[PDB]
Write a protein that binds this ligand. Structure first.
Ligand SMILES: CCCCCCCCCCCCC/C=C/[C@H](O)[C@H](N)CO
Ligand SMILES: CCCCCCCCCCCCC/C=C/[C@H](O)[C@H](N)CO
Lengths: 64, 59, 278, 238, 252, 60, 59, 238, 278, 59
């Protein structure tokens, strides 16, 4: 029963991959990864990853 | 830096008001509801070879 | 009123005067007026570089922070709050101030205070108007440790009281610095032996704010949040600086993830569109 | 007792105010002002400085110094081309994150001419001529060299002065254009053409590099303060 | 011709025959601190020409895949004769600088360098929330070297050329006093920096004033048979230096 | 501290007002005014123009 | 002790406002949003041996 | 009816105000003012007065008059020392509760020079010389007499004028220092050295006492009103 | 504007002029300018001894006291309150005023009134706005004994009414003393035979304040607390005095526990630090 | 019956404010926070036979 984050930030052009979309309990330092939703394509100048910080809030995720 | 104008008043029987502008922009000022000029010579009489109104203006 | 410069008329030219051929190798931006390469006409230009001045660019009511605290908590630590004053936890005003390396200004400070009734069983009350206290502690002074502390008696520290429903609180603050200007960037250490802490964190030293409800403990919890709005004015700035590319990560350093230069393209030349059809 | 009527807009907080407030530290002794060199009074003093344009941003060279390197070499057929982009200093991907484009993204209107400077960073034995051209909108992008020489062009001869200036004037119907994209304020196209060739002697490298600069003229102006579309924050930085 | 320039300081003289225009400062020339902007009370030490003279740093080798080098200049001149000795005995000090960067090749060579002086170039760390050692920021007269890819050495600076250590676009560094050494036509890299700070005098060790960076945008490229070893030499002078607060010998 | 008495009609909104208000876009640079032909200053310049009268309006 | 300035207004088609300072400290005053001067000669053209822009400025 | 807009900061109570209020006892006849000798207009008239420094505060002499007595005697080897402290008039334990330090603890910035006066309270047959030295920061504390004579020192010969003045000037990079402790505004060290010895005749007591004073010069200034860290109250006094 | 004095340049010296050798035995502080012992430079100094003046030191809104009273109590004595006016129950303003021996000033007085709903079964009410009365009684006048006393009818005594939610009450008070100045310290007795009460308590004689709710008895208890904030202004002070070392014990005398002079040290000399290692 | 003074401002780089007294008593007025004079000659140097500071001032 450690500290956990919320559900990661719902983006309107990306969805989670499939180890991360089902499971809860995100500890600190956890990286999650997003994939392009259908039908979208990747922007190569941005890395689609989110780290959860010490204050139990994710990093800024805008539009991948 | 005040300015004193006349108030809109009746006829056949010159009261003044005072005005100060408080803000730095001119879009802030109160509306100019005291300009009564007109010139209906571009819509009426919009012709060339200006008529006389007593002549027949033809032939 | 200082208008922008005008365009002068010109004609054909065949001479040894070459304004286009320059040397960009001499650290020098060429000053080619458009009347030197093409034949122009007389343009009397009436535009003013007014809203691009450093005052008109920085003197907007920006922010710095959101602050939360309750009026009935079992733990005595969430009944009041505090904030060490920097301008580097929100990225918009941080990036705008970090266009320049040195700044000097006065600050106009506004608070926006909103209270929400928390969830409890006895939620139907008749509560009178909440009253707030915002006390400023200069660098080095004594700090409160509870809501009923006697350090809140503000005999020398400046504090502001506010009642729910009025105009928001606003006060002006002079140039409160020990150097000749503020530092957006500091390339050095805190200790003379080049150890310690690195960067701008050595020079912050502004003191901190403390927030509580002036009322006694209510019969139902109400959480209040106050937003500190910073707004600079009377501004001077020195030795400009490129805009930041990467995203900020922390408030005490300049550490970053390496981001590329711009958005990509698919090829190096342009052409007409190849979508659907005529 | 003075008769006073409160008007609408009382007890509000507007962000762009110019009012007066009381000082919390009264009669405070402010430290003496010092002459620090390099004072900025207007942000348009910054935008008139040259900064290199990442033209070669083709899908991988963004993450390198190759974004700034424009390729040029000897071509087996003239009448050719070098590059081209769309004149949108803050909407187009090429000059988006430039110094002029990042000053220009805090605004929403712009006006005035734009300079372009091309430093040829090749050998001193290499020589050649280019066609630097601007095309005002209304037709499409030119597809030949003979369609691009109908525009506003200059022919650049490489020599002892290794850089030239293409000055893009203000050809518009409105006084202002939008720094974002609308179809009503389209601004034209910038293309560069192999005109002749690159001619080198023996034992000299053929493939050289052009660097492109951009700045603003002395009639450039920006108008509507907005927030930049490039700042993004999710949580507080701590 | 205006391609020729002589620069004389102390007992040292630099002659160049392929200068383009000697680049010099923010428009301001260095000068001693006036007594209307001064803070310290005892008499300054305007030492002599014994500090106001040229010192040559180490040479870095410009290869085909080199990325960039940097220095920290109040700290790089810390063992350079009596200048460095004054740094070790005084608490406050102050100087402008004449930086002259030299580099030469032949006419069959090609490649272009950017030489920038950046005030307050606060470098960012390779791993994010972690300290930086002083040896990775400033290594004396020895240059630290940028990379192409992102770096992940522990307690080290994030060294990518396309972010310049600080986190900006590297094509935007032409806002600072700079030049280019295009091997086609240049050697004239002066930057005569004035004293730039937010205080009238400052400590030489605890503060870094600015950062010299030499970044090749058009890389070095030559045909087979030309000289493959091309050095780059950086020479630096203090100007109108003065010192204040004399005490025992300082922090080495 | 000035002695002020609020009079009736305070804090109302009347539609035909002539008061002053603060500008939300301060120091805004308004575009130059152009001489467009055909300016109307009074609506009575329009009413003095002839217009045809639909007299034969008999039911179809 | 009032001071009267001009309001920011449009061109091609001098309105005044008045100002009184109420507080004893100068940090209290309203911001100076009407200084439009500039001098971009220290950032552009930051060289020695000032060029002519019509000469080649080399050799 | 006057059109009025209320601005933010209305109906607040700020502690450092300068407003006007109505009198509860109107037209009250105030008693005539009398010329009482000894008027204070500025608190800096008080701080420029000498007050004795409790230098010998070594762990028990605080609760006695021995805190003010600095020991001096004849030493079997010269090159020695007498005492030393850190120049922090309000952070250092030595001159913390002094007159200058207690005026100075209601503030947060200070500036200007500081005087030190040393009254030799020994016999009239005793004689000797001392090394009174100030060391600006940046190096450590000096450990020899030859490291302390590189600073700002004066050699004091004891004679018919039994007291000397060590004047500590303002050697700083900022205009102000903090009256509390930060590492950015370190101020130096004050040490006193047996230079030669104490030389007495027969049947004269060897062990004598120096008294140290401190005050401020005519360029001393304090800036930020805060509350003193020495007042402490738990309940109301009744 | 009276700037601080400047530093003049000097040079080497070898003469019979001895500014360092003084006599501190003559009650005399030496006035050694720093240009007399070391060689200095010309410093044009622009500092102002502005915020150290006695007005700028004392004219902050300090306090004096907290006052509690209820609106529904079974005992009729806790329904109103009172306070005999001194300035010696809070130590900060007491110590600041006792820097000087005589003072003369006007007082600006502010009240901060906050009400808390007490605990009862019927806690859900609909209460209208509470109204408070603060009546001042000059020395010798008649005192109230209940909340419905007819001595509250304030026909000659100055009283202040306040409604919940407004700006706080503030009024100015002139120099209300029978001597030429106030006395921080009085070394004498009340009776001519050197008996009676000793100290400053003979000279207080200010009258007292009385506090009640103007409303009638409510159906649920609400406790109100008003904080009297004293703020001196138009200040003159005479014959200065050392700052107090020991802690205050009572409000009517100067009695103390004997405290040592300062904080201790471990040895009489300084050296470099002996902590951890290189 | 207004009076115009100078505002407290910085050095090395004369702004005025205006003041009106509204009440009939002088205890009502705002505090005088702009008197910067001093004379520390009654506490320091409080002696007879005024010294010279260059002489020994004894014997
Ligand atoms: C009781 C109300 C008092 C409110 C106090 C809040 C603000 C006081 C602190 C001064 C604000 C300084 C503004 C920021 C400073 C510099 O710009 C930053 N260091 C950026 O370099
Ligand atoms: C209805 C509101 C009236 C408020 C009355 C409250 C204050 C009236 C009493 C005068 C205050 C005197 C101030 C203190 C006096 C001296 O400083 C002390 N004795 C210290 O020596």
């Amino acid at each position: 029963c450690n500290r956990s984050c919320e559900v990661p930030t719902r983006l309107n052009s990306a969805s989670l991959k499939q180890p991360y979309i089902t499971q809860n309990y995100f500890p600190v330092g956890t990286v999650v990864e997003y994939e392009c939703r259908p039908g979208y394509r990747r922007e190569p100048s941005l890395s689609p990853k989110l780290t959860c910080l010490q204050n139990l809030k994710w990093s800024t995720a805008v539009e991948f | 830096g005040a300015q004193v104008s006349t108030q809109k008043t009746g006829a056949h029987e010159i009261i003044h008001y005072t005005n100060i502008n408080y803000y730095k922009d001119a879009a802030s000022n109160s509306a100019n509801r005291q300009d009564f000029t007109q010139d209906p010579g571009k819509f009426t009489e919009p012709v060339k070879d200006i008529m006389v109104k007593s002549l027949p203006a033809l032939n | 009123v200082v208008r922008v410069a005008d365009t002068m008329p010109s004609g054909p030219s065949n001479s040894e005067s070459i304004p286009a051929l320059t040397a960009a190798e001499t650290g020098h931006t060429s000053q080619v007026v458009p009347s030197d390469t093409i034949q122009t006409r007389h343009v009397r230009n009436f535009h003013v570089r007014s809203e691009s001045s450093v005052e008109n660019f920085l003197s907007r009511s920006a922010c710095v922070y959101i602050v939360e605290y309750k009026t009935r908590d079992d733990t005595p630590d969430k009944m009041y709050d505090s904030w060490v004053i920097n301008t580097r936890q929100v990225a918009q005003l941080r990036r705008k101030l970090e266009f320049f390396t040195y700044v000097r200004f006065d600050v106009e400070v506004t608070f926006v205070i909103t209270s929400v009734q928390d969830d409890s069983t006895r939620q139907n009350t008749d509560t009178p108007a909440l009253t707030h206290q915002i006390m400023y502690v200069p660098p080095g002074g004594p700090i409160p440790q509870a809501v009923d502390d006697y350090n809140w008696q503000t005999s020398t520290n400046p504090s502001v009281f506010w009642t729910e429903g009025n105009a928001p609180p606003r006060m002006s603050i002079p140039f409160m610095s020990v150097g000749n200007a503020y530092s957006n960037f500091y390339d050095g250490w805190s200790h003379f032996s080049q150890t310690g802490v690195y960067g701008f964190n050595t020079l912050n030293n502004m003191g901190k704010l403390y927030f509580r409800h002036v009322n006694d403990k209510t019969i139902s919890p109400i959480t209040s949040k106050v937003r500190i709005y910073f707004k600079p004015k009377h501004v001077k700035a020195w030795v400009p600086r490129p805009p930041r590319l990467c995203e900020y990560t922390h408030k005490d350093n300049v550490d970053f993830e390496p981001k590329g230069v711009t958005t990509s393209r698919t090829q190096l030349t342009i052409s007409n569109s190849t979508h659907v059809e005529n | 007792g003075l008769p006073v009527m409160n008007t609408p807009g009382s007890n509000q907080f507007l962000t762009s105010d110019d009012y007066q407030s009381p000082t919390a530290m009264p009669q405070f002794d402010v430290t003496p002002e010092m002459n620090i060199p390099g004072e900025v009074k207007n942000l348009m003093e910054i935008a008139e400085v040259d900064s290199v344009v990442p033209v070669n941003n083709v899908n991988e060279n963004v993450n390198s110094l190759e974004a700034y390197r424009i390729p040029v070499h000897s071509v087996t057929e003239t009448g050719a081309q070098v590059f081209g982009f769309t004149l949108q200093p803050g909407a187009d991907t090429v000059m988006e994150r430039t110094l002029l484009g990042e000053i220009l993204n805090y605004y929403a209107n712009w006006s005035g001419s734009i300079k372009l400077t091309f430093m040829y960073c090749g050998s001193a034995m290499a020589t050649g001529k280019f066609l630097l051209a601007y095309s005002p909108p209304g037709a499409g992008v030119p597809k030949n060299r003979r369609e691009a020489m109908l525009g506003t062009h200059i022919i650049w001869d490489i020599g002892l002065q290794s850089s030239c200036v293409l000055c893009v004037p203000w050809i518009s119907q409105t006084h202002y254009r939008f720094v974002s994209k609308d179809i009503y304020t389209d601004a034209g196209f910038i293309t560069c053409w192999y005109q002749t060739s690159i001619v080198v002697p023996a034992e000299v490298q053929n493939q050289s590099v052009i660097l492109c600069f951009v700045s603003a003229c002395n009639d450039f102006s920006v108008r509507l303060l907005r927030d930049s579309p490039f700042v993004r924050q999710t949580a507080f930085y701590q | 011709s205006d391609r020729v320039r002589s620069i004389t300081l102390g007992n040292s003289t630099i002659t160049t025959q392929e200068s383009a225009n000697v680049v010099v400062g923010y428009g301001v020339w260095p000068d001693y601190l006036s007594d209307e902007e001064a803070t310290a009370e005892d008499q300054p030490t305007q030492p002599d020409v014994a500090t106001c003279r040229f010192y040559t740093l180490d040479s870095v080798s410009w290869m085909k895949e080199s990325q960039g080098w940097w220095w920290k200049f109040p700290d790089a001149l810390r063992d350079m004769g009596l200048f460095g000795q004054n740094m070790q005995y005084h608490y406050l000090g102050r100087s402008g600088y004449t930086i002259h960067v030299q580099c030469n090749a032949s006419k069959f060579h090609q490649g272009c360098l950017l030489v920038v002086c950046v005030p307050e170039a606060e470098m960012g760390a390779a791993n994010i929330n972690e300290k930086i050692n002083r040896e990775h920021l400033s290594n004396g007269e020895v240059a630290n070297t940028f990379s192409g890819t992102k770096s992940s050495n522990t307690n080290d600076v994030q060294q990518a050329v396309f972010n310049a250590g600080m986190g900006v676009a590297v094509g935007n560094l032409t806002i600072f006093p700079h030049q280019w050494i295009n091997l086609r036509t240049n050697n004239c890299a002066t930057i005569v920096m004035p004293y730039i700070n937010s205080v009238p005098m400052d400590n030489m060790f605890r503060h870094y004033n600015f950062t010299l960076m030499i970044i090749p945008f058009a890389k070095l490229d030559y045909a087979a048979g030309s000289s493959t070893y091309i050095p780059i030499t950086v020479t630096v002078a203090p100007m109108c230096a003065e010192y204040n607060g004399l005490r025992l010998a300082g922090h080495q």
